Design a protein around this ligand. Structure first.
Ligand SMILES: Nc1ncnc2c1ncn2[C@@H]1O[C@H](COP(=O)(O)OP(=O)(O)OP(=O)(O)O)[C@@H](O)[C@H]1O
Ligand SMILES: O=c1[nH]c(=O)c2nc[nH]c2[nH]1
Ligand SMILES: [Ca+2]
Ligand SMILES: [Zn+2]
Lengths: 458, 48, 145, 28
């Protein structure tokens, strides 16, 4: 029974992982349809009610069904990608921390600089019964013990890694291990590693895309409390489309500069508010009638709010929306005030704020264009220009698809891992030793077979 | 070295051929790849 | 076909003034600049549509009483009593307005939602007018360039 | 009319705090 239920559960997980993308686009349809239906509410009558202005009359049950379907699809879209990309993130982090433990001694000799959240958090997984769970190296603890045990204390290293130093020789003597069936009780209790699942969950909640999916699911749930909360899912097209991702990234690309120039605009408008509050108070009557005055600059807070809310948005500055200074002793002073406000705040600072984001968008697009232009002008591996190969017809294409293919390099690395150590050829053993010692000089750097044999070949 | 006919020169100087040549020049120089530039040029020769 | 339709109505001959666009190179360049970044322009117009829709949702849920576009108190011409008309009002008026929707909606002084509506108007003016409209214009201008 | 610029303070400690801060600014 247990085998059947586990097989069915794993089949469901694999199905969700396979169809993670399809379910995301289905969620996109459901958000579109829900919002198209939402576009037909109206307020009716005090007690106000938001009711559909429907002629066919089927939209309301359709809307409820669509909302339920959206929540279910979002839950499926998180379970998928939890079965799909969380293992990759866990593997990458495990590899990083294992390499830091072995080559760097970042938890034996160095210790984190106390400001790295991930450096501090990764300490919990070190003393775990299953440190490498996605990472292939199951003897990282053994090699760390061999490298650092004798110098810094074998007992301390063993305690830090949560392992037994006297077990390895006994295992090499005899295995002394027995398998077991799964219908027994508390076996899952023995097998589960609460600390490892703790660390994994911390990493998952640190992951950005998981956070986005969780926010999507939370908004979908809130959509049942209020149907208008489904409007936030229309922002998913921004992530769906590249140019919209570029547009959103342009907002925060020059983040510090944009914040600082907004602060500068704030300071200069505050200075203008001070000047107006001290000298030009009588000109800030925003009342159409003389019966009662709505003075907007009788106090500094309201004057500053008025300046920001009105003068910045005004085409001609504050002078567009304040009184006329004709026939006044402060006429020239207030004319200078208005002209300088219009010049510094509207003409210059607002233009700079806009241009920061516009140029960030342009820079991101140009960076993408430059990336695409590269690998069409030079090879990814060797770096030789395309024209040198292009001297012969289809030369660059042949070089990049049959001589220096990065996919071919990846396949070669996989073939080296899968092949037995004893049966490696000379070249295979050479590459394998250099890869294990992390020596990347076997990659052709500025040279190729054709360049080496440029006169023997033709 | 070869012979060019005055009739061929006149037809080359006719305005429609000039428009075709302008369009082809823009196409090859702007977006036409240098890999098959000669192929495109021969095709343009046959069409002209 | 337009020349033939010109006999049915003489004003149909006005469409033939667009032939100067094909006649002149720089006008061909100007017209080609419109569709040069076609996908990017369509997608950014859609983004503007989505953000204005979000602002319409917020106004329809919280700032309905401020959308009375009637000059007299005899009868109110409420522009945000339903979502469709509120969205049409936002697109048709706030986008074309220099200062955003706040130029053409009521004044929030002396209200419990004064600061919220001030933030609403400022963010609308910044995101829709200052940024997104500028991006839409710049796409075509840079395509021409 | 005589107009006066006065703090609209609820806690009421801003004015002596303001004077102390002004003196501190000059010294700094
Ligand atoms: N060493 C290299 N190996 C492979 N491709 C390379 C290398 N150097 C440069 N390139 C270039 O990288 C590009 C690979 O093609 P591309 O990335 O479009 O493939 P794809 O993923 O199959 O395509 P698509 O994005 O349409 O799914 C080619 O333009 C090729 O010239
Ligand atoms: O080989 C050929 N190429 C041509 O373009 C052509 N035109 C006429 N006859 C021809 N033969
Ligand atoms: Ca051998
Ligand atoms: Zn190469």
């Amino acid at each position: 029974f247990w085998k059947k239920i586990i097989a069915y559960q794993q089949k469901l997980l694999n199905y969700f992982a396979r169809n993670f993308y399809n379910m995301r686009m289905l969620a996109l349809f459901v958000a579109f349809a829900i919002n198209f239906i939402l576009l037909f509410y109206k307020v009716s009558t005090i007690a106000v009610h938001y009711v559909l202005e429907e002629s066919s009359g089927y939209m309301e049950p359709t809307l409820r069904i669509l909302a339920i379907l959206h929540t279910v699809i979002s839950f499926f879209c998180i379970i998928g990608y939890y079965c799909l990309k969380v293992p990759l993130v866990i593997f990458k982090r495990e590899k990083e921390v294992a390499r830091k433990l072995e080559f760097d001694g970042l938890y034996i000799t160095e210790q984190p600089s106390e400001d790295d959240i991930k450096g501090q958090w990764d300490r919990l997984v070190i003393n775990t019964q299953s440190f490498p769970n996605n990472y292939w190296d199951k003897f990282v603890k053994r090699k760390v013990m061999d490298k650092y045990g004798e110098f810094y204390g074998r007992d301390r290293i063993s305690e830090l890694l949560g392992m037994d130093k006297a077990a390895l020789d006994f295992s090499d003597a005899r295995e002394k291990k027995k398998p077991k069936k799964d219908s027994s009780l508390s076996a899952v209790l023995n097998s589960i590693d609460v600390k490892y699942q703790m660390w994994k969950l911390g990493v998952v909640f640190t992951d950005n895309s998981f956070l986005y999916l969780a926010w999507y699911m939370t908004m979908s749930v809130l959509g049942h409390y209020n149907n208008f909360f489904f409007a936030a899912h229309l922002l998913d097209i921004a992530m769906g489309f590249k140019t919209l991702r570029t547009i959103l990234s342009s907002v925060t690309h020059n983040g510090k500069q944009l914040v600082l120039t907004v602060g500068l605009l704030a300071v200069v408008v505050y200075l203008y508010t001070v000047v107006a509050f001290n000298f030009f108070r009588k000109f800030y009557n925003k009342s159409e009638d003389g019966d009662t005055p709505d003075m907007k600059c009788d106090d500094m807070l309201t004057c500053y709010m008025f300046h920001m809310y009105v003068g910045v948005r005004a085409g001609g500055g504050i002078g567009d929306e304040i009184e006329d200074p004709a026939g006044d002793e402060y006429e020239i002073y207030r004319i200078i005030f208005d002209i300088t406000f219009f010049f510094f705040v509207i003409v210059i600072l607002l233009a700079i704020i806009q241009g920061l984001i516009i140029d960030a968008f342009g820079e991101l697009r140009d960076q993408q264009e430059q990336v695409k232009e590269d690998m069409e002008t030079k090879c990814f591996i060797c770096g030789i220009g395309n024209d040198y190969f292009d001297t012969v017809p289809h030369g660059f294409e042949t070089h990049t698809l049959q001589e220096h293919n990065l996919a071919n390099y990846l396949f070669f690395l996989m073939y080296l891992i899968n092949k037995d150590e004893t049966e490696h050829t000379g070249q295979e053993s050479y590459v394998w030793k250099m890869y294990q010692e992390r020596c990347w000089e076997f990659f052709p750097a500025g040279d190729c077979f054709r360049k080496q044999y440029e006169d023997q070949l033709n | 070295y070869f012979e060019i006919s005055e009739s061929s020169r006149t037809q080359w100087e006719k305005p429609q051929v000039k428009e075709s040549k302008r369009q082809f020049i823009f196409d090859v120089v702007n977006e036409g790849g240098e890999k098959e530039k000669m192929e495109l040029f021969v095709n343009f020769c046959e069409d002209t």
